[PDB]
């Protein structure tokens, strides 16, 4: 119950937070359209605001990572962890600290898991590093988070402020469709945000570019060797090479877009956690000292 | 020169977000601009790394605008008077 600092709700903020947890193959992105396809999502985080089938077995709720929010302002971290620590080995590598936290809390009660979360110095440090100066000095209504994640052929709704994990999941045909149904049941608006936990897009794009480039190199080598040698036709090799070049161009543009988006994340984080006090003070002092503060102030008086 | 720390300052009645911007920064001498950039966020300071020109979105922000607005409000609340500054230094002594 010590208390952490308060964070803003931003997909870039959460992406950089998870990167600061040592988990480097994960990225958070906002879901504007629910029906738009999302590829390989690890889970979803649902934030609600300004508004008015339980697993109750004591062995079942302990056999899965359902943590209870003990630290007050740790909601974003809690939801992100409820999503990530309910993923397995195949797709992502959790950080060293996150893997240690996962093994440490194997059969613990929800309370004990929440306490383990709250008493991990790495997590608290990384979470409070993303706080604005306003939150720091305020320490002296926000959002409520709910996680959605598939475990074993069943979709789970984890709420750190509720006694039991909500299991209401089954599908046959893909869990994204079941989650879309469940969300369309309960549901633009400013009282709701929806974010998807997805693999790092930059990584997938770079790998696709590597594959495209090596295939293009193979076909260009064979083609140039053939033409040098000087019989058979070479139409199909040229067609293959043309389509490979087109795909490489498309994916290079994708990589550039993702790179500038990551840079925008970085700059928004660097500004969000900056204390502009000394800058404003010295700026106003230099304006006064230069003799031009008076004119400017006379031009921008607040209307009354 | 002019009141910068008391609720009776004219700044407490001034739209600071419009006062402090790229043109107003350009009004300053180069040495002043360098010493001032040394107080920006590291990304914008790095972007500006002999008049210095700032990023078009260095001061025109979402965070710097709120910084200006909250700075004016804190000035009105009296957070910047030397008595409150010494009181916060006594509190900092109590913390350390």
UniProtKB/Swiss-Prot annotation, chain A:
GO molecular function: chromatin binding; cysteine-type deubiquitinase activity
Residue ranges annotated for the ULD domain, each copy included: 275-303
Enzymatic reactions: Thiol-dependent hydrolysis of ester, thioester, amide, peptide and isopeptide bonds formed by the C-terminal Gly of ubiquitin (a 76-residue protein attached to proteins as an intracellular targeting signal)
Domain UCH catalytic stretches: 3-199
Location of the protein in the cell: Nucleus
Active site feature: 75, 144
Disruption phenotype: Polycomb phenotype leading to lethality, probably due to misexpression of homeotic genes.
Marked site (Transition state stabilizer) residue numbers: 69
Impact reported for residue 192 to A: No effect on homodimerization
EC number: 3.4.19.12
Effect of residue 211 to R: Abolishes homodimerization. Severely attenuated deubiquitination of histone H2AK118ub1 substrates
Keywords, ordered alphabetically: Chromatin regulator, Coiled coil, Hydrolase, Nucleus, Protease, Thiol protease, Ubl conjugation pathway
Function of the protein: Catalytic component of the polycomb repressive deubiquitinase (PR-DUB) complex, a complex that specifically mediates deubiquitination of histone H2A monoubiquitinated at 'Lys-119' (H2AK118ub1). Mediates bisymmetric organization of the PR-DUB complex and is involved in association with nucleosomes to mediate deubiquitination. Does not deubiquitinate monoubiquitinated histone H2B. Required to maintain the transcriptionally repressive state of homeotic genes throughout development. The PR-DUB complex has weak or no activity toward 'Lys-48'- and 'Lys-63'-linked polyubiquitin chains.
Name by which UniProt lists this protein: Ubiquitin carboxyl-terminal hydrolase calypso
Organism: Drosophila melanogaster (Fruit fly)
Native organism taxonomy: Eukaryota, Metazoa, Ecdysozoa, Arthropoda, Hexapoda
Gene name for this UniProt entry: caly
Portion of the full-length sequence here: 43 to 404 of 471
Swiss-Prot record, chain B:
UniProt motif (LXXLL motif 1) ranges: 16-20
Tissue specificity note: Highly expressed in nurse cells and deposited in oocytes late in oogenesis. Ubiquitous in early embryos. Late embryos show higher levels in CNS and neurectoderm.
Span of domain DEUBAD: 7-96
Transmembrane annotation, as ranges: none
Name by which UniProt lists this protein: Polycomb group protein Asx
Originating organism: Drosophila melanogaster (Fruit fly)
Family note: Belongs to the Asx family.
Record comment regarding domains: The DEUBAD domain is involved in modulation of the ubiquitin C-terminal hydrolase activity of caly/calypso. It contains two Leu-Xaa-Xaa-Leu-Leu (LXXLL) motifs involved in the interaction with caly/calypso. It also contains an Asn-Glu-Phe (NEF) motif involved in stabilizing the association of the PR-DUB complex with ubiquitin to promote deubiquitinase activity.
Outcome (variant: residue 62 to K/Q): Reduced affinity for ubiquitin and loss of ubiquitinase activity of the PR-DUB complex
Motif NEF motif mapped to chain: 61-63
Sequence motif LXXLL motif 2, residues: 36-40
């Amino acid at each position: 119950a010590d208390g952490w600092l308060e964070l803003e709700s931003d997909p870039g903020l959460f992406t950089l937070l998870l990167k600061d947890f040592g988990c480097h193959d994960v990225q958070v992105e906002e879901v504007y359209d629910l029906q738009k396809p999302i590829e390989s999502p690890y889970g979803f985080i649902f934030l609600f605001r300004w508004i008015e089938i339980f697993v109750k077995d004591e062995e079942a709720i302990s056999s899965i990572f359902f943590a209870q929010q003990v630290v007050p302002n740790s909601c974003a971290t809690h939801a992100l962890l409820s999503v990530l620590l309910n993923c397995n080995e195949n797709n992502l590598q959790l950080g060293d600290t996150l893997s240690r936290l996962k093994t440490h809390t194997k059969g613990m009660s929800p309370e004990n898991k929440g306490l383990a979360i709250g008493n991990t110095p790495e997590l608290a440090c990384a979470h409070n590093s993303h706080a604005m100066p306003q939150a720091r000095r305020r320490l002296e209504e926000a959002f409520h988070f709910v996680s959605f994640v598939p475990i074993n052929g069943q979709l789970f709704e984890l709420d750190g402020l509720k006694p039991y994990p909500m299991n209401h999941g089954g599908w046959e045909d893909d869990w994204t469709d079941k989650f879309r149904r469940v969300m369309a049941e309960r549901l633009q608006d400013i009282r709701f945000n929806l974010m998807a936990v997805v693999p790092d897009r930059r990584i997938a794009i770079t790998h696709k570019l590597k594959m495209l480039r090596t295939n293009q190199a193979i076909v260009s080598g064979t083609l140039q060797k053939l033409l040098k040698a000087g019989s058979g036709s070479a139409r199909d090799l040229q067609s293959l090479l043309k389509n490979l070049d087109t795909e490489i161009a498309i994916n290079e543009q994708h990589l550039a877009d993702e790179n500038d988006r990551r840079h925008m994340f970085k700059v928004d984080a660097s500004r969000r956690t900056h204390n502009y006090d000394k800058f404003i003070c010295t700026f106003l002092s230099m304006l006064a000292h230069q003799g031009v503060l008076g004119e400017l102030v006379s031009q921008h008086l607040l209307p009354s | 020169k002019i009141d910068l720390e008391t609720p009776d300052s004219i700044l407490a009645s001034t739209n600071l977000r419009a006062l402090l911007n790229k043109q107003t920064f350009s009004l300053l001498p180069p040495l002043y601009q360098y010493n001032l950039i040394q107080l920006l966020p590291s990304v914008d300071r790095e972007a500006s790394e002999e008049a210095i020109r700032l990023s078009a979105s260095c001061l025109n922000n979402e965070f710097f605008a709120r910084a200006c607005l909250e700075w004016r409000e804190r000035l009105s609340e009296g957070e910047f008077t030397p008595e409150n500054q010494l009181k916060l230094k006594t509190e900092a002594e109590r913390e350390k």
